[PDB]
Amino acid sequence: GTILLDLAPEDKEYQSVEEEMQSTIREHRDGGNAGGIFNRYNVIRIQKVVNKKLRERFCHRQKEVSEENHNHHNERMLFHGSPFINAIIHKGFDERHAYIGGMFGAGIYFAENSSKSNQYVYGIGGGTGCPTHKDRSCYICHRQMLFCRVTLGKSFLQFSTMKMAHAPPGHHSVIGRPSVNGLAYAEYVIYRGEQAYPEYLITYQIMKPE
Numbered sequence: 001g002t003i004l005l006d007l008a009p010e011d012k013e014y015q016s017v018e019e020e021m022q023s024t025i026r027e028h029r030d031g032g033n034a035g036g037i038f039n040r041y042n043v044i045r046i047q048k049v050v051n052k053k054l055r056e057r058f059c060h061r062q063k064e065v066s067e068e069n070h071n072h073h074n075e076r077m078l079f080h081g082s083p084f085i086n087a088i089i090h091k092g093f094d095e096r097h098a099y100i101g102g103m104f105g106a107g108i109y110f111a112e113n114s115s116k117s118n119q120y121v122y123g124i125g126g127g128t129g130c131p132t133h134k135d136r137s138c139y140i141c142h143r144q145m146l147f148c149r150v151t152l153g154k155s156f157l158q159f160s161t162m163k164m165a166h167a168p169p170g171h172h173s174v175i176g177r178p179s180v181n182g183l184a185y186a187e188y189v190i191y192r193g194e195q196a197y198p199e200y201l202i203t204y205q206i207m208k209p210e
């Protein structure tokens, strides 16, 4: 059973989440087609996801990865956008639904830039936008994204497409780094659902630039 705990805006924990969300917005190559046009979000609320069973699976794997990486689990807080956010907060991430179409193959994808995750909230390339207005740039409808704890362990650096089914030998994750001819922004990939915990559930709106 998942329990959603509201965080007060005056709480330093709420402020840290909003600060990372706002500060990591960037301009995307698609000129805002997938996620919309905006320089800031309006944060509606931030809830902590509490689930004992999911936490135990996460901590158990974190100990295993720590033992395989000279006692460093290498956790990072990263964003994830998905139309299936309800299933994620109740059952956790699931590699059985890993992104077949991804540049690093069938893994679970995360971004260090909140605006890159916002491109996936309504589907691949923003699908057809919000259910109500069918607008990928809707300023009215409340969106939701996750800010997750992700166990990276020994991360495998890549610049180019390399379709994998699992992390490479001796590794626990794959990080696609930006390059002039390749990625504009980073992407973090894990191949096991228990290497991520959906810590924060952010409800927000993109704001129309003035």
Ligand SMILES: O=C(c1cc(Cc2n[nH]c(=O)c3ccccc23)ccc1F)N1CCN(C(=O)C2CC2)CC1
Binding pocket: 079, 080, 081, 082, 084, 087, 088, 092, 093, 094, 095, 097, 098, 099, 100, 107, 108, 109, 110, 111, 116, 117, 118, 120, 124, 187, 188
């Ligand atoms: O990893 C994906 C996934 C990711 C993407 C890409 C993606 N999605 N979301 C992001 O924030 C992101 C950031 C950087 C680069 C790519 C992304 C597309 C379709 C997908 F199925 N999954 C889909 C949602 N997940 C689940 O376990 C759902 C509940 C069944 C986790 C696995």
Ligand SMILES: [Zn+2]
Binding pocket: 130, 131, 132, 133, 134, 135, 138, 139, 140, 141
């Ligand atoms: Zn809308």
